[PDB]
């Protein structure tokens, strides 16, 4: 619960002149790991460390930027991961573990979820070491499936989530209230509830157009 004990402190740090001052990296780089480990997030604190690393490239630390990058990818399809590469130098995108984390990040924004779980190397204990990261990306997979699909095959949803078993899939099936159709597919969303198209000749404008033409 060290996340809750730094919110007030780091909140006034990042609104002052201490976000251009490189000396504050002590409390800030600590608070970046406190997001990753304790499963919390703060973009302002990440983005300030990224900007202080873009100011002096020497103070760049690989694992602290991985703790930024991995937790940026849990928060998709937001531009958190967009602002990461903006600040990370040409030299600094070719580091370890950064190069592998960035490549895995490319697969998520292009929604190549079967390639994502294939691409994983399982010997990098840092990717095991982020708490709730393995489920967060799965919750983002199922998040986009609800927005973009009406029906999905039981085998297809499994494979997107890293080739799940019958029992492991029971969590993800229960999560958004999904169910199995007659001898076949999972039901994700109703057809008319997914699409919500825009309209021709809505023509509500007379309630203002008549009032400007009044005199």
């Amino acid at each position: 619960a060290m996340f809750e004990q730094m919110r007030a402190n780091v909140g006034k740090l990042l609104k002052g002149i201490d976000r251009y001052n490189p000396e504050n990296l002590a409390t800030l780089e600590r608070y970046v790991e406190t997001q990753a480990k304790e499963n919390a997030y703060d973009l302002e604190a990440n983005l300030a460390v990224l900007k202080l690393y873009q100011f002096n490239p020497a103070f760049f630390q690989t694992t602290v930027t991985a703790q930024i990058l991995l937790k940026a990818l849990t928060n998709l399809p937001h531009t958190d991961f967009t602002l990461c590469k903006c600040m990370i130098d040409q030299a600094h995108q070719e580091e370890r573990p950064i190069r592998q984390i960035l490549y895995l990040g490319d697969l998520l924004e292009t929604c190549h979820f079967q390639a994502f779980w294939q691409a994983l190397d399982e010997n990098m204990d840092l990717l095991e070491g982020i708490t709730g990261f393995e489920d967060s990306v799965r919750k983002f997979i199922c998040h986009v499936v609800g927005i973009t699909y009406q029906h999905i095959d039981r085998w297809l949803l499994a494979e997107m989530l890293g080739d799940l078993t019958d029992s492991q899939l029971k969590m993800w099936m229960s999560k958004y209230g999904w169910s199995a159709d007659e001898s076949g597919q999972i039901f994700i969303c109703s057809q008319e509830e997914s699409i919500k198209p825009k309209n021709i000749v809505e023509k509500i404008d007379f309630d203002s157009v008549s009032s400007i033409m009044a005199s």
Partner: protein
């Protein structure tokens, strides 16, 4: 030497005035009251604020893009030069908005979208067109960075329209009048490449002199040539970041191209795959619900004929322009086709045309004043 005789004498005169701006705005109401009275124009007091927005940014961009190590420029300005002027108790008049837009212009050189909403909250005083057009300038650029293409394209249309109910005389946006033309032209051209099936609403936003050339650019870009990826990205870079002055181009100093590696290669990643999303949407949805005849007719368009198939189609459908069903027993693909509407321009014009009547009836009643 004449170069840095001019540059150093700007900053040293601004660092002088920065103390006067903190000293007047906070506490000395008789000094502000004495400054209300004497001249016939308070415009001289106001202009020096956002005059030093773009001139100081030029001088600090030079010092930034000459010294790339042991950073003097960026922490001095960021700590003292910017936050002292803006953070503290503001001036008792519209001058407080001018320093806010000056600080927003400095904030936008850091590629970010977070504080734009917190700055908008502190824009308490009324949105005069002079302040409002320059707000929508950077707020639209923030929506452009936020991947809100559908939002940012609407925001660029109004600020390029040039019927915004002001005469705009007496140098209020000087030396850069066509930068507001060409930057809004350029940044709108990037957004259209993604989402061209919703925007019927194009015609007021960009003029037919430019829509003809930018129209064929988008088609030539997405369909058949990566050439437009080059020439679009060449024009887009000086406008997306706004680096006010590039330093003297010579090989004897290096010093300048090193910050341009990062500044340019940051926007490389933006247009890279966001352009390759476009070609999928480029082939218009001919038949709205596709049977085997049209699904296989579109798998041939999805990519090359190979022993792995349908998976790339299932990937490409996950982006913001596709919503669909697959039915397994039918083997059927059902999909959303989406558009907006053609008849909206006119009812926005009905006031704009009346301003061509109004200013017409008014200006000749200012001549009817004089020669009478």
């Amino acid at each position: 030497q004449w170069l840095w005789d001019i540059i150093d004498e700007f900053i040293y005169q601004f660092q002088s005035f920065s103390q006067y701006r903190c000293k007047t705005a906070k506490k000395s109401e008789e000094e502000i009251d004495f400054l209300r009275s004497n001249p016939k124009i308070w415009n001289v007091h106001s202009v020096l604020n956002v005059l030093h927005s773009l001139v100081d940014k030029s001088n600090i961009n030079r010092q930034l893009e000459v010294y790339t190590s042991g950073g003097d420029p960026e922490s001095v300005a960021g700590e003292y030069g910017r936050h002292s002027l803006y953070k503290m108790l503001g001036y008792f008049s519209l001058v407080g908005l001018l320093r806010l837009h000056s600080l927003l212009g400095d904030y936008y050189q850091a590629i970010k979208v977070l504080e734009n909403i917190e700055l908008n909250k502190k824009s308490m005083y009324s949105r005069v067109p002079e302040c409002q057009v320059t707000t929508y300038y950077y707020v639209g650029f923030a929506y452009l960075m936020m991947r809100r293409y559908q939002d940012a394209i609407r925001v660029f249309a109004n600020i390029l329209l040039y019927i915004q109910r002001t005469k705009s005389m007496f140098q209020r946006t000087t030396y850069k009048y066509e930068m507001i033309n060409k930057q809004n032209e350029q940044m709108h051209a990037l957004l259209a490449i993604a989402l061209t099936m919703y925007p019927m609403r194009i015609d007021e936003s960009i003029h037919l002199q430019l829509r003809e050339k930018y129209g064929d650019k988008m088609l030539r870009m997405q369909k058949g040539d990566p050439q437009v990826y080059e020439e679009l990205f060449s024009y887009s870079c000086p406008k997306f970041l706004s680096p006010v002055v590039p330093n003297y181009d010579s090989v004897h100093p290096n010093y300048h191209k090193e910050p341009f590696l990062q500044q340019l290669k940051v926007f490389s990643d933006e247009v890279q795959q966001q352009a390759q999303l476009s070609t999928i949407r480029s082939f218009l949805k001919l038949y709205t619900t596709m049977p085997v005849a049209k699904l296989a007719g579109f798998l041939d368009l999805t990519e090359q004929e190979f022993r792995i198939q349908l998976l790339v189609f299932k990937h490409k459908m996950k982006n913001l322009v596709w919503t669909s069903g697959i039915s397994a027993l039918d083997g059927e693909f059902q999909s959303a086709s989406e558009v907006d509407f053609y008849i909206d321009k006119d009812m926005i014009h009905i006031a704009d045309t009346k301003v061509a009547r109004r200013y017409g009836d008014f200006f000749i009643r200012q001549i009817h004043k004089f020669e009478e």
